[PDB]
Amino acid sequence: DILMTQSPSSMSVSLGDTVSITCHASQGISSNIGWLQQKPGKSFMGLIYYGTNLVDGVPSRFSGSGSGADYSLTISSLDSEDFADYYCVQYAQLPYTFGGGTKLEIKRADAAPTVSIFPPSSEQLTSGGASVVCFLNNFYPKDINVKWKIDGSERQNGVLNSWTDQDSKDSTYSMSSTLTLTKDEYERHNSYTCEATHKTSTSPIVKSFNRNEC
Amino acid sequence: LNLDPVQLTFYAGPNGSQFGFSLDFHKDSHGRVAIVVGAPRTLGPSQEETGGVFLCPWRAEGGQCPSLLFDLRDETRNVGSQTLQTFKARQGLGASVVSWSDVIVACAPWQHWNVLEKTEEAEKTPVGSCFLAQPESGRRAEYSPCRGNTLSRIYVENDFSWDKRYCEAGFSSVVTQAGELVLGAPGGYYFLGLLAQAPVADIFSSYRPGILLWHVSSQSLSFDSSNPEYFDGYWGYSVAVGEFDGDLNTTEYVVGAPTWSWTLGAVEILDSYYQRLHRLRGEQMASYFGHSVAVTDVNGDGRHDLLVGAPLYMESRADRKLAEVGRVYLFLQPRGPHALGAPSLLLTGTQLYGRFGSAIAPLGDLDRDGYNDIAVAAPYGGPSGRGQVLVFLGQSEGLRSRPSQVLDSPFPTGSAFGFSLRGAVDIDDNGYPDLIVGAYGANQVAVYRAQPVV
Amino acid sequence: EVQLQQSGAELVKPGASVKLSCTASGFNIKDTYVHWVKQRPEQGLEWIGRIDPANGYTKYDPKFQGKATITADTSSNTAYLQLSSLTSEDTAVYYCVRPLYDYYAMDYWGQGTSVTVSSAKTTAPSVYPLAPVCTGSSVTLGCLVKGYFPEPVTLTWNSGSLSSGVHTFPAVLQSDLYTLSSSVTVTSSTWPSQSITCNVAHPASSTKVDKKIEPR
Amino acid sequence: GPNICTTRGVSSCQQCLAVSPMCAWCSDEALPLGSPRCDLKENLLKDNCAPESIEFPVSEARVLEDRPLSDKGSGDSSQVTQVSPQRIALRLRPDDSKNFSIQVRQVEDYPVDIYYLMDLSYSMKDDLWSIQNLGTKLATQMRKLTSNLRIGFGAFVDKPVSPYMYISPPEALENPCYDMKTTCLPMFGYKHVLTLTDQVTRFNEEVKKQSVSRNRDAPEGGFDAIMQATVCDEKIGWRNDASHLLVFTTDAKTHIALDGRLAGIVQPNDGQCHVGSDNHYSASTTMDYPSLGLMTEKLSQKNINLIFAVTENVVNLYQNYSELIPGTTVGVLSMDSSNVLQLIVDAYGKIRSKVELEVRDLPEELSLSFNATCLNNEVIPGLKSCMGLKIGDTVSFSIEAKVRGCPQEKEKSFTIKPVGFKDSLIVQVTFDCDCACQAQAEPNSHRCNNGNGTFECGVCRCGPGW
Amino acid sequence: XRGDWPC
Ligand SMILES: *[C@@H]1O[C@H](CO)[C@@H](O[C@@H]2O[C@H](CO)[C@@H](O[C@@H]3O[C@H](CO)[C@@H](O)[C@H](O[C@@H]4O[C@H](CO)[C@@H](O)[C@H](O)[C@@H]4O)[C@@H]3O)[C@H](O)[C@H]2NC(C)=O)[C@H](O)[C@H]1NC(C)=O
Ligand SMILES: *[C@@H]1O[C@H](CO)[C@@H](O[C@@H]2O[C@H](CO)[C@@H](O)[C@H](O)[C@H]2NC(C)=O)[C@H](O)[C@H]1NC(C)=O
Ligand SMILES: *[C@@H]1O[C@H](CO)[C@@H](O)[C@H](O)[C@H]1NC(C)=O
Ligand SMILES: [Ca+2]
Ligand SMILES: [Ca+2]
Ligand SMILES: [Ca+2]
Ligand SMILES: [Ca+2]
Ligand SMILES: [Ca+2]
Ligand SMILES: [Ca+2]
Ligand SMILES: [Mg+2]
């Protein structure tokens, strides 16, 4: 099988820029490569076939190039719809193989997260379970780290994280974290904390709450 | 009648290139009429015969012509764990040429093809190919509908069904008014013969250099058959188009199969879906009935008439003796949706081995009397066997039994003067249609200008 | 226009078999090769195999041999991908692909068919309100939707009235049951002075439960 | 009394003979005034005309060479006589007609050449095994019909060129059976193997060394081989004095003229020999297949009797060709070529069972009529061909030559020859239009107006030129 | 078979 090393995994760029995407093969493939586009939450669309030829209907700002085992897809003057996923596929040998994929994200000014912690609810505590939620809304870049602390000591088991796609009208990311404990184990400790680490702050952002106390 | 045999015009190509094997009139976007000439034994880049095409501008003195350049390099593509191979050596590029709008279609019927997969192959075979060009813009495209990627083992495990490996696509060609290319492939389906059709516009828009195997969704190929009557029939040795069903939205095809039904020879009229409308059976075995077919309205009733050439017809003579001279058959289309009857007229050659009927070119209305006329070639006819072209005039009841004019070959012996013909185009803009005659044996083309009737 | 209309989403049990379809619209399925591609979020895109619907011959990646079975029926103008002995590893989206011009290309893609393999039964989502702790310039509320199957669920605030300033997060599969959360931000004078309710709908169990957010 | 000679009012002796073959002329000086010189021979002698001054030519037919019909065709190479007479002189006056006889015999024990031209394409794999003892077996059965017999062998496949020939893989050129688990000979057009020889064991041993090749399309290039085996006289070895049999065996269709265009070949067949010292046909890849008319011309020129020994699945095909090539014989060959011997013997009988007359170099004015005597002393009018004869039968014909008027050339010759026969009847015609007295004429005679006329045959004619 | 092979 032929391995397709597609670089980079992601890039944050603005409109009007001219970006390029490399795709390196395990061996020569003599321009037998194709490029694909998958708009967020949609299906795939053909961009390039046989290395340099455009699929009917694709704007001319797209262009494929390269030879041997190194190939590049270039978009001149990025457009709003161009922010999507891009994959390279080789068909010089069977089986066909795909590249890791590249995600084009919108660049903007850095923004610190807006953390807020939420204790378990009345309806949930009376059912023998307990969940602490920690929302981290509207930040940039996507790189972020969350850490839970029960009575100051770190906790790693029982955490469920979930991230959003880059919001359309402000180009920010949001994250959700849920520490799920039993009602019995939840009432063994007092203090609960979720720390957030971002490149915008050398010191982590902290928001805690004490059980019973309010 | 009124072709000028005193002041001819001669175009010439390289020695041994068979310049003039095929020819046609060509009109650029401005209406300027030129002559496209195929030379299938022209030397290529490897100093090896590959063929070539020439685009001759109209000049009263003639002379030499500039070439219409095409890619003559063998191609190779390693894709899908397979290896595709095109071999252009001795492909005979220019063994047939045809012009439509501002596009020239030149075909190499013996271009070879092969597909390799590890230790197996598809067999190196002549699928043929056609090269399309737009001289003014420089656009190029190709069309080779019989290329496949099926290994030889599959055809064998299968009784050789749908075997297009020996098509020789482009052997004969023609384009409809709408711009639909129609290629004759006599070797298709294990030498049964097939036709391939596809719009010119789509051939250009779907072709890219280096792909070698691409899809043309709007293409249309004829169908295979288990009928032994079509075996070795070379269905598609000759092709033409016309109007034979009354419906002017549909275009009908005329196909020659000179060895159909055990060398009896036949000609068939089809629709655009290859459904056979009429079939005209040969008269005598090995006469090659269907070697050439022509379509033109000779009796001036608005209905296309059919002309079939049988160059090897042997005429019955005194004392049970047969003499090969060649024969042409005329079929007048009947009023309304009825079947074409028996031949309305039989034209028979005179010179032994002359091959009268090898080529048949409609001339348009040469003498401007109201009836279209034709020309018949006997490439080895005439009292000296040097080649001869005879003109027959149309009349209300068909054609005239005797020729109105006879053009003797201006070339030496062996020129095959008349092997290719083309008329019905006013090349000097004098109001009369003119005739161009190929003589590949001499690597030359002669132009006969029609003048007012004396 | 070339369109590849694949079957609807499938939800089956581990160890069963499912058969996906890819009906052609605007052309004949007999024309070109037809490929099948598997897409997973972590592993990415994997090529399953191809088929020539004209003759039926197939090709596969040795990985999917025995699990994937590609067939085609020119009568109904459709190509099929059958999967057997299903696993949580076979939970992915599947696309059928045909080329445009180049015989060996991958240019036209169907909309895809999502396959989910789980033995869990239909479970109603437990809806839990999330209220802040015992004050700033703005306030944020939340709504937790835990323990439901299968997907999806539609969450709205005030029956679609409060749309701006809302963040609904993608669901996460926590041991054969999904969990989903949502947030919303307003000014400190909007709440609790005005009522705010979380509306969650789970069509599978036919429940549109709603909880109002209450202070502490 | 007055007849058609006097009622035309002739002017000279020449015009008197042209009136009718029964008129005569009297050149007597002492002829009465009211006496016609252009009357019957009896009337002139009744009118007291000098017998020596009578001009009355009589059409005659005198034999010059009347050699007898030979009983045996053996011995001497070769002065056998099968046509009698061989030369006769013919004298004819204007509008007259004389008759003569002719006899033809199918001589027993006449030499025979048999050239076996065999299809060795892959479709003939099993056929080759059934004829490896044919040479001696064939001598045994022909020993009963002729003492002189020569046999030869030749093989063909098709034009060794794509697409007829497999051209891949590279090893398929040296061994066209490469994609199979067998080995066959590289492809070849036509190869001459054994020159016509009386050593029949040379046939057996050569056949045992032969083997098949293999090509792609069903029809084969046998007509190429038929042409070369006909026009390459010196190589095949046809004898000037023998019946020539060309046995053509195949199990498939045949390529014909203009088929060669599927290989890029467009040059017509030239009908010339192209088999060199290597015994292979060198024009196979550069020259098209021959046409039926061209094959007929050469076959008729070298006196070759073509025999189509084909399998039942193509018999009708080759039967239909055999009607476009007159003189050709068809026999049904079994699928393994096991009955080829009896087939050759049956065809030899059909070949020597016809006696058809042909006329060469016949003048324009002459027309001939024929009465046959075939079967058994049975006259058949208007017939010049006999059928159903055995070797040793003799037939004859009666012929009348009716000349129209007087021709310019007074000396001509034509030939009556049976088709396929060597001997022929030469007829030397002489036209007796003039009178004998015309030679000793008196130009510028004193008897005709003092030098104005010429005194010939007792009358005055206007000299040259009034 | 149709080609150069017995029927
Ligand atoms: C060798 O030569 C044989 C003698 O010519 C020839 O035999 C003839 O074959 C033809 C074609 O099959 C026969 O034609 C038939 O015509 C009669 C009517 O008289 C019908 O029995 C029949 O129907 C017609 O078929 C036509 C199409 O073929 C069609 O146009 C008509 O409308 C009608 O349907 C036959 O077609 C003929 O009877 C045969 N004659 C004899 C004397 O046998 C062989 O085919 C030929 N073979 C080879 C291998 O060359
Ligand atoms: C061939 O035979 C025919 C018929 O037997 C002959 O025709 C007649 O022959 C007799 C013979 O004396 C004549 O008297 C008749 O006038 C002939 N009648 C005709 C010709 O209509 C014929 O003479 C014979 N021909 C030859 C060349 O022997
Ligand atoms: C000519 O024919 C007659 C019959 O009228 C015949 O008796 C005679 O033998 C023939 N003459 C010759 C020279 O054979
Ligand atoms: Ca029509
Ligand atoms: Ca008409
Ligand atoms: Ca006219
Ligand atoms: Ca003109
Ligand atoms: Ca056999
Ligand atoms: Ca063959
Ligand atoms: Mg054979």
PDB file of C-alpha atoms in Angstrom, chain C residues 52-215:
ATOM      1  CA  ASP C  52     -17.572  -2.645 -12.817  1.00  0.00           C
ATOM      2  CA  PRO C  53     -21.404  -2.833 -12.957  1.00  0.00           C
ATOM      3  CA  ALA C  54     -21.225  -3.837 -16.638  1.00  0.00           C
ATOM      4  CA  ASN C  55     -19.607  -7.214 -15.886  1.00  0.00           C
ATOM      5  CA  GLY C  56     -19.647  -7.478 -12.073  1.00  0.00           C
ATOM      6  CA  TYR C  57     -15.922  -7.942 -11.423  1.00  0.00           C
ATOM      7  CA  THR C  58     -14.735  -6.421  -8.149  1.00  0.00           C
ATOM      8  CA  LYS C  59     -11.588  -5.322  -6.319  1.00  0.00           C
ATOM      9  CA  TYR C  60     -11.065  -4.863  -2.581  1.00  0.00           C
ATOM     10  CA  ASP C  61      -8.533  -3.643  -0.072  1.00  0.00           C
ATOM     11  CA  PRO C  62      -7.262  -6.816   1.692  1.00  0.00           C
ATOM     12  CA  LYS C  63      -8.378  -5.244   4.979  1.00  0.00           C
ATOM     13  CA  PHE C  64     -12.090  -5.302   4.075  1.00  0.00           C
ATOM     14  CA  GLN C  65     -12.001  -8.745   2.432  1.00  0.00           C
ATOM     15  CA  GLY C  66     -14.680 -10.925   4.021  1.00  0.00           C
ATOM     16  CA  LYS C  67     -16.510  -7.970   5.603  1.00  0.00           C
ATOM     17  CA  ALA C  68     -17.449  -5.967   2.483  1.00  0.00           C
ATOM     18  CA  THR C  69     -19.415  -7.352  -0.475  1.00  0.00           C
ATOM     19  CA  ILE C  70     -19.994  -5.041  -3.451  1.00  0.00           C
ATOM     20  CA  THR C  71     -22.659  -5.911  -6.032  1.00  0.00           C
ATOM     21  CA  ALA C  72     -24.569  -4.102  -8.770  1.00  0.00           C
ATOM     22  CA  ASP C  73     -27.844  -4.488 -10.679  1.00  0.00           C
ATOM     23  CA  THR C  74     -28.067  -2.604 -13.986  1.00  0.00           C
ATOM     24  CA  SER C  75     -31.842  -3.179 -14.111  1.00  0.00           C
ATOM     25  CA  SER C  76     -32.621  -0.967 -11.108  1.00  0.00           C
ATOM     26  CA  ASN C  77     -29.513   1.120 -11.966  1.00  0.00           C
ATOM     27  CA  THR C  78     -28.066   0.735  -8.464  1.00  0.00           C
ATOM     28  CA  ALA C  79     -24.852  -0.427  -6.786  1.00  0.00           C
ATOM     29  CA  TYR C  80     -24.740  -2.039  -3.349  1.00  0.00           C
ATOM     30  CA  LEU C  81     -22.288  -2.416  -0.461  1.00  0.00           C
ATOM     31  CA  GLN C  82     -23.092  -5.173   2.040  1.00  0.00           C
ATOM     32  CA  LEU C  83     -21.366  -5.409   5.425  1.00  0.00           C
ATOM     33  CA  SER C  84     -21.430  -8.536   7.588  1.00  0.00           C
ATOM     34  CA  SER C  85     -20.478  -9.354  11.186  1.00  0.00           C
ATOM     35  CA  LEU C  86     -20.772  -5.740  12.230  1.00  0.00           C
ATOM     36  CA  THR C  87     -18.740  -4.116  14.997  1.00  0.00           C
ATOM     37  CA  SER C  88     -18.329  -0.748  16.683  1.00  0.00           C
ATOM     38  CA  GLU C  89     -15.308  -0.480  14.364  1.00  0.00           C
ATOM     39  CA  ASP C  90     -17.722  -0.467  11.396  1.00  0.00           C
ATOM     40  CA  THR C  91     -19.489   2.666  12.705  1.00  0.00           C
ATOM     41  CA  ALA C  92     -18.730   5.232   9.998  1.00  0.00           C
ATOM     42  CA  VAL C  93     -20.095   7.044   6.942  1.00  0.00           C
ATOM     43  CA  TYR C  94     -19.959   5.286   3.570  1.00  0.00           C
ATOM     44  CA  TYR C  95     -19.788   7.020   0.181  1.00  0.00           C
ATOM     45  CA  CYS C  96     -20.095   5.696  -3.366  1.00  0.00           C
ATOM     46  CA  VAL C  97     -17.782   7.307  -5.918  1.00  0.00           C
ATOM     47  CA  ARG C  98     -17.500   7.337  -9.710  1.00  0.00           C
ATOM     48  CA  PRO C  99     -15.070   9.187 -11.991  1.00  0.00           C
ATOM     49  CA  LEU C 100     -15.825  12.113 -14.296  1.00  0.00           C
ATOM     50  CA  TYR C 101     -13.543  11.489 -17.294  1.00  0.00           C
ATOM     51  CA  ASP C 102     -10.433   9.576 -16.157  1.00  0.00           C
ATOM     52  CA  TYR C 103     -11.226   5.859 -15.838  1.00  0.00           C
ATOM     53  CA  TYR C 104      -9.390   5.622 -12.501  1.00  0.00           C
ATOM     54  CA  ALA C 105     -10.475   8.902 -10.882  1.00  0.00           C
ATOM     55  CA  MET C 106     -12.646   9.709  -7.815  1.00  0.00           C
ATOM     56  CA  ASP C 107     -14.577  12.844  -8.799  1.00  0.00           C
ATOM     57  CA  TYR C 108     -18.327  12.347  -8.199  1.00  0.00           C
ATOM     58  CA  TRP C 109     -19.446  11.490  -4.663  1.00  0.00           C
ATOM     59  CA  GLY C 110     -22.780  10.511  -3.189  1.00  0.00           C
ATOM     60  CA  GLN C 111     -24.172  12.289  -0.161  1.00  0.00           C
ATOM     61  CA  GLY C 112     -23.121   9.341   2.005  1.00  0.00           C
ATOM     62  CA  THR C 113     -24.854   6.897   4.336  1.00  0.00           C
ATOM     63  CA  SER C 114     -24.255   6.881   8.091  1.00  0.00           C
ATOM     64  CA  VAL C 115     -24.062   3.491   9.821  1.00  0.00           C
ATOM     65  CA  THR C 116     -24.263   3.081  13.602  1.00  0.00           C
ATOM     66  CA  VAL C 117     -23.661  -0.275  15.304  1.00  0.00           C
ATOM     67  CA  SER C 118     -24.907  -0.607  18.881  1.00  0.00           C
ATOM     68  CA  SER C 119     -27.010  -3.038  20.901  1.00  0.00           C
ATOM     69  CA  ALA C 120     -28.542  -0.406  23.202  1.00  0.00           C
ATOM     70  CA  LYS C 121     -32.295   0.156  23.075  1.00  0.00           C
ATOM     71  CA  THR C 122     -34.266   3.370  22.639  1.00  0.00           C
ATOM     72  CA  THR C 123     -33.803   5.441  25.802  1.00  0.00           C
ATOM     73  CA  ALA C 124     -35.393   8.780  26.679  1.00  0.00           C
ATOM     74  CA  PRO C 125     -32.982  11.648  27.452  1.00  0.00           C
ATOM     75  CA  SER C 126     -32.722  12.810  31.053  1.00  0.00           C
ATOM     76  CA  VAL C 127     -32.912  16.620  30.999  1.00  0.00           C
ATOM     77  CA  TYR C 128     -31.160  18.513  33.799  1.00  0.00           C
ATOM     78  CA  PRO C 129     -31.148  22.294  34.361  1.00  0.00           C
ATOM     79  CA  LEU C 130     -27.882  24.087  35.100  1.00  0.00           C
ATOM     80  CA  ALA C 131     -27.941  27.237  37.241  1.00  0.00           C
ATOM     81  CA  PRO C 132     -24.978  29.389  38.334  1.00  0.00           C
ATOM     82  CA  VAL C 133     -23.418  29.653  41.778  1.00  0.00           C
ATOM     83  CA  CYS C 134     -24.040  32.267  44.473  1.00  0.00           C
ATOM     84  CA  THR C 135     -23.051  38.281  40.046  1.00  0.00           C
ATOM     85  CA  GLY C 136     -20.962  39.742  37.223  1.00  0.00           C
ATOM     86  CA  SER C 137     -21.991  41.890  34.276  1.00  0.00           C
ATOM     87  CA  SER C 138     -23.318  38.917  32.277  1.00  0.00           C
ATOM     88  CA  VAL C 139     -24.720  35.501  33.179  1.00  0.00           C
ATOM     89  CA  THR C 140     -24.614  32.064  31.554  1.00  0.00           C
ATOM     90  CA  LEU C 141     -27.111  29.208  31.924  1.00  0.00           C
ATOM     91  CA  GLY C 142     -26.924  25.595  30.811  1.00  0.00           C
ATOM     92  CA  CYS C 143     -28.948  22.522  29.910  1.00  0.00           C
ATOM     93  CA  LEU C 144     -27.682  18.943  30.239  1.00  0.00           C
ATOM     94  CA  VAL C 145     -29.140  16.112  28.135  1.00  0.00           C
ATOM     95  CA  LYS C 146     -27.761  12.793  29.387  1.00  0.00           C
ATOM     96  CA  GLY C 147     -28.468   9.143  28.635  1.00  0.00           C
ATOM     97  CA  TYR C 148     -30.341   8.864  25.337  1.00  0.00           C
ATOM     98  CA  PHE C 149     -30.218   6.658  22.242  1.00  0.00           C
ATOM     99  CA  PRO C 150     -30.251   6.884  19.356  1.00  0.00           C
ATOM    100  CA  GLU C 151     -29.398  10.260  17.857  1.00  0.00           C
ATOM    101  CA  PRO C 152     -30.361  13.011  17.221  1.00  0.00           C
ATOM    102  CA  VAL C 153     -32.003  15.479  19.612  1.00  0.00           C
ATOM    103  CA  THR C 154     -33.073  19.061  18.887  1.00  0.00           C
ATOM    104  CA  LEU C 155     -32.471  21.601  21.661  1.00  0.00           C
ATOM    105  CA  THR C 156     -33.949  25.110  21.667  1.00  0.00           C
ATOM    106  CA  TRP C 157     -34.319  27.881  24.244  1.00  0.00           C
ATOM    107  CA  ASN C 158     -37.762  29.460  24.749  1.00  0.00           C
ATOM    108  CA  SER C 159     -39.095  27.368  21.836  1.00  0.00           C
ATOM    109  CA  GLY C 160     -36.672  28.947  19.370  1.00  0.00           C
ATOM    110  CA  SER C 161     -37.116  32.512  20.641  1.00  0.00           C
ATOM    111  CA  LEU C 162     -33.614  32.881  22.118  1.00  0.00           C
ATOM    112  CA  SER C 163     -31.304  31.873  19.260  1.00  0.00           C
ATOM    113  CA  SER C 164     -28.433  34.378  19.415  1.00  0.00           C
ATOM    114  CA  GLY C 165     -25.770  33.839  22.059  1.00  0.00           C
ATOM    115  CA  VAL C 166     -26.370  30.075  22.295  1.00  0.00           C
ATOM    116  CA  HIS C 167     -23.844  27.220  22.085  1.00  0.00           C
ATOM    117  CA  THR C 168     -25.087  23.652  21.590  1.00  0.00           C
ATOM    118  CA  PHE C 169     -22.251  21.114  21.731  1.00  0.00           C
ATOM    119  CA  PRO C 170     -21.956  17.902  19.695  1.00  0.00           C
ATOM    120  CA  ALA C 171     -23.115  14.741  21.419  1.00  0.00           C
ATOM    121  CA  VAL C 172     -20.619  12.316  22.960  1.00  0.00           C
ATOM    122  CA  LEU C 173     -21.123   8.546  23.209  1.00  0.00           C
ATOM    123  CA  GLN C 174     -20.649   7.553  26.862  1.00  0.00           C
ATOM    124  CA  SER C 175     -21.063   3.761  27.063  1.00  0.00           C
ATOM    125  CA  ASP C 176     -23.734   3.124  24.421  1.00  0.00           C
ATOM    126  CA  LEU C 177     -25.670   6.279  25.407  1.00  0.00           C
ATOM    127  CA  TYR C 178     -25.223   9.833  24.148  1.00  0.00           C
ATOM    128  CA  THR C 179     -24.769  13.022  26.172  1.00  0.00           C
ATOM    129  CA  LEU C 180     -25.344  16.591  24.985  1.00  0.00           C
ATOM    130  CA  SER C 181     -25.031  20.008  26.632  1.00  0.00           C
ATOM    131  CA  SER C 182     -25.939  23.575  25.704  1.00  0.00           C
ATOM    132  CA  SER C 183     -25.214  27.060  27.044  1.00  0.00           C
ATOM    133  CA  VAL C 184     -26.561  30.594  26.635  1.00  0.00           C
ATOM    134  CA  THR C 185     -25.373  34.060  27.713  1.00  0.00           C
ATOM    135  CA  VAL C 186     -27.394  37.197  28.517  1.00  0.00           C
ATOM    136  CA  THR C 187     -26.997  40.297  30.671  1.00  0.00           C
ATOM    137  CA  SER C 188     -27.258  40.172  34.459  1.00  0.00           C
ATOM    138  CA  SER C 189     -30.569  42.081  34.344  1.00  0.00           C
ATOM    139  CA  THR C 190     -32.250  39.661  31.912  1.00  0.00           C
ATOM    140  CA  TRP C 191     -32.122  36.710  34.332  1.00  0.00           C
ATOM    141  CA  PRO C 192     -33.753  35.655  36.570  1.00  0.00           C
ATOM    142  CA  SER C 193     -36.055  38.629  35.942  1.00  0.00           C
ATOM    143  CA  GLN C 194     -37.248  36.825  32.786  1.00  0.00           C
ATOM    144  CA  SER C 195     -38.128  33.147  32.479  1.00  0.00           C
ATOM    145  CA  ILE C 196     -35.865  30.872  30.418  1.00  0.00           C
ATOM    146  CA  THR C 197     -36.733  27.244  29.606  1.00  0.00           C
ATOM    147  CA  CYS C 198     -34.698  24.522  27.881  1.00  0.00           C
ATOM    148  CA  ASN C 199     -36.701  22.649  25.235  1.00  0.00           C
ATOM    149  CA  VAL C 200     -35.351  19.208  24.280  1.00  0.00           C
ATOM    150  CA  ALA C 201     -36.996  16.865  21.767  1.00  0.00           C
ATOM    151  CA  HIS C 202     -36.253  13.160  21.229  1.00  0.00           C
ATOM    152  CA  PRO C 203     -38.444  11.870  18.375  1.00  0.00           C
ATOM    153  CA  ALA C 204     -37.384   8.241  18.915  1.00  0.00           C
ATOM    154  CA  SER C 205     -39.120   7.983  22.303  1.00  0.00           C
ATOM    155  CA  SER C 206     -41.653  10.737  21.416  1.00  0.00           C
ATOM    156  CA  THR C 207     -40.749  13.159  24.198  1.00  0.00           C
ATOM    157  CA  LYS C 208     -40.431  16.944  24.176  1.00  0.00           C
ATOM    158  CA  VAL C 209     -39.499  17.532  27.825  1.00  0.00           C
ATOM    159  CA  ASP C 210     -38.735  21.074  28.993  1.00  0.00           C
ATOM    160  CA  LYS C 211     -37.169  22.370  32.221  1.00  0.00           C
ATOM    161  CA  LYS C 212     -37.125  25.937  33.543  1.00  0.00           C
ATOM    162  CA  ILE C 213     -33.882  27.270  35.028  1.00  0.00           C
ATOM    163  CA  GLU C 214     -34.121  28.184  38.713  1.00  0.00           C
ATOM    164  CA  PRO C 215     -31.630  30.081  40.917  1.00  0.00           C
TER     165      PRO C 215
END
